[PDB]
Amino acid sequence: HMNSDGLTGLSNRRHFDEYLEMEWRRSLREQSQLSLLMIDVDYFKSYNDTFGHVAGDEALRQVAGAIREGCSRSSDLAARYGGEEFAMVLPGTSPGGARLLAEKVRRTVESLQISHDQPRPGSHLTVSIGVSTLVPDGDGQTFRVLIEMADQALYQAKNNGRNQVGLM
């Protein structure tokens, strides 16, 4: 279908949700691991406010390209979840693999060297990432647990200073 976000080229949220649910159903039947990354651009409001929406949108586009590079297996999916929030579904990926992929995405973003004055003068645009991995339990609608766990890890990453990967 026409299931991508125009600016970023990634999956849109609706497609993400449908795909995650389908992979959750499969992983529940198989008792296989499913990993998820939740990604949120650091200090994005201040970036957009300082540099304007054209620059902010182009930054999001470049970040999205960095994220897309994280996908390599046929079942991997990257999405724009919300305004400055991205997600990646990683079927069959074990936690150390998911962690290192998250570090890859984070470092690839920082290597864009998009100048920013937050958190201090002479900084770069960064992302925080939360990672979760589960063997599913419950039913098809229990897939929201995996999102919650990744959001918890992301909350931890943000509060611990941003530009980092949070786990569990």
Side-chain angles (χ1 to χ4, degrees):
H1 191 282
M2 307 189 79
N3 60 9
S4 67
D5 177 74
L7 172 66
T8 66
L10 302 180
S11 179
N12 75 12
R13 162 63 173 278
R14 192 219 345 101
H15 187 241
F16 165 89
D17 289 339
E18 187 175 85
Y19 186 68
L20 178 56
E21 193 192 320
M22 186 180 335
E23 286 299 308
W24 181 267
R25 290 193 311 260
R26 189 170 86 10
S27 289
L28 180 71
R29 180 170 70 240
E30 296 184 7
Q31 289 293 285
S32 55
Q33 290 175 350
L34 182 51
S35 288
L36 177 72
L37 283 44
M38 293 303 312
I39 302 159
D40 185 299
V41 181
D42 296 327
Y43 308 111
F44 189 67
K45 173 173 168 52
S46 63
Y47 189 86
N48 206 57
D49 289 356
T50 298
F51 302 111
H53 80 88
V54 171
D57 280 358
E58 287 314 285
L60 288 177
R61 185 177 168 215
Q62 291 223 132
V63 169
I67 295 171
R68 194 172 329 103
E69 292 176 31
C71 296
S72 70
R73 295 175 177 85
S74 60
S75 51
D76 296 341
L77 189 62
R80 191 187 185 178
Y81 209 64
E84 68 197 63
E85 189 183 3
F86 302 87
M88 301 181 48
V89 193
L90 303 173
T93 295
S94 184
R99 177 185 70 75
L100 288 157
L101 188 42
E103 287 294 355
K104 169 181 170 58
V105 169
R106 185 186 66 81
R107 291 165 166 154
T108 303
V109 171
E110 188 173 4
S111 293
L112 301 167
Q113 301 276 276
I114 297 168
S115 175
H116 196 7
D117 64 9
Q118 295 299 328
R120 59 195 62 266
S123 298
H124 302 286
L125 197 73
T126 62
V127 290
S128 300
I129 305 180
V131 181
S132 60
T133 307
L134 284 171
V135 177
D137 58 64
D139 58 35
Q141 295 301 306
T142 304
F143 76 93
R144 295 189 188 79
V145 169
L146 191 66
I147 302 174
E148 175 168 353
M149 290 176 50
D151 277 353
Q152 170 59 19
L154 175 62
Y155 178 81
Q156 294 288 87
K158 289 286 185 181
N159 287 303
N160 197 48
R162 288 171 173 71
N163 188 33
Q164 66 191 266
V165 180
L167 301 179
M168 307 138 215

